[PDB]
């Protein structure tokens, strides 16, 4: 069936199951500390998150 084959893919792993939480793309994901977002949006919103370039 269409309902039986529209979601027949196991998404329990891999870099396509997870994505960014801003862009929802599958490249350059910062999965560290539960950020789960791409590095460009991390550079954009690091001041709003709290990461600052000290050294």
């Amino acid at each position: 069936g269409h309902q039986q084959l529209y979601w027949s893919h196991p998404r329990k792993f891999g870099q396509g199951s997870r994505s960014c939480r801003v862009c929802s793309n599958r490249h350059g994901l910062i999965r560290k500390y539960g950020l789960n977002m791409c590095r460009q949006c991390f550079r954009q919103y690091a001041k709003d998150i709290g990461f600052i370039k000290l050294d």
Partner: protein, 171 residues
């Protein structure tokens, strides 16, 4: 907490909370003069001051949009009933706020005011409000297809060092 999250993930999740909340209120209160938020967490309650310019325009019809924003936070962030409270407050000396003058300038250019006259009006308004200096850089396509970038700088303006982190404001 029953799931017992870590503090390393907790401060990062609070930073993502502040970033997503700032972006949501920036996209939603753009036409009303948004300038910032400040959040306070207590036991069983979470207070937050929205800091904006036009308080009547951010409240609407007797706090209707404020109640809508409380319901937004309650539905999206999983907060209990009455566990979060929002309060709108007027920006004192709003001419020094960089993002408020930026949103004023982009709404002037969206209404259809010319670029030179709009930059002159913004610079005259902030020098009447009283500031140390300014830097109005409007980049884009002007009078044709070639990208032409303008720059209107007068007064004291610092660029380098640690004082550029918290002595100026960039929008």
């Amino acid at each position: 907490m029953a799931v017992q999250i870590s503090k390393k993930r907790k401060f990062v999740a609070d930073g993502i909370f502040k970033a997503e909340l700032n972006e949501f209120l920036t996209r939603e209160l753009a036409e009303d003069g948004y300038s910032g938020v400040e959040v306070r967490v207590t036991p069983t309650r979470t207070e937050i001051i929205i800091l904006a310019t036009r308080t009547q325009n951010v409240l609407g019809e007797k706090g209707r949009r404020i109640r809508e924003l409380t319901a937004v936070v309650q539905k999206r962030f999983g907060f209990p009933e009455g566990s979060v409270e929002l309060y709108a407050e007027k920006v004192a000396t709003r001419g020094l706020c960089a993002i408020a003058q930026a949103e004023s300038l982009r709404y002037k250019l969206l209404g259809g005011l010319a670029v030179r006259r709009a930059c002159y009006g913004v610079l005259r308004f902030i020098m009447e409000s009283g500031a140390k200096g300014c830097e109005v850089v409007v980049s884009g396509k002007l009078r044709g297809q070639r990208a032409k970038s303008m720059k209107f700088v007068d007064g004291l303006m610092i660029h380098s060092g640690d004082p550029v982190n918290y002595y100026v404001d960039t929008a």
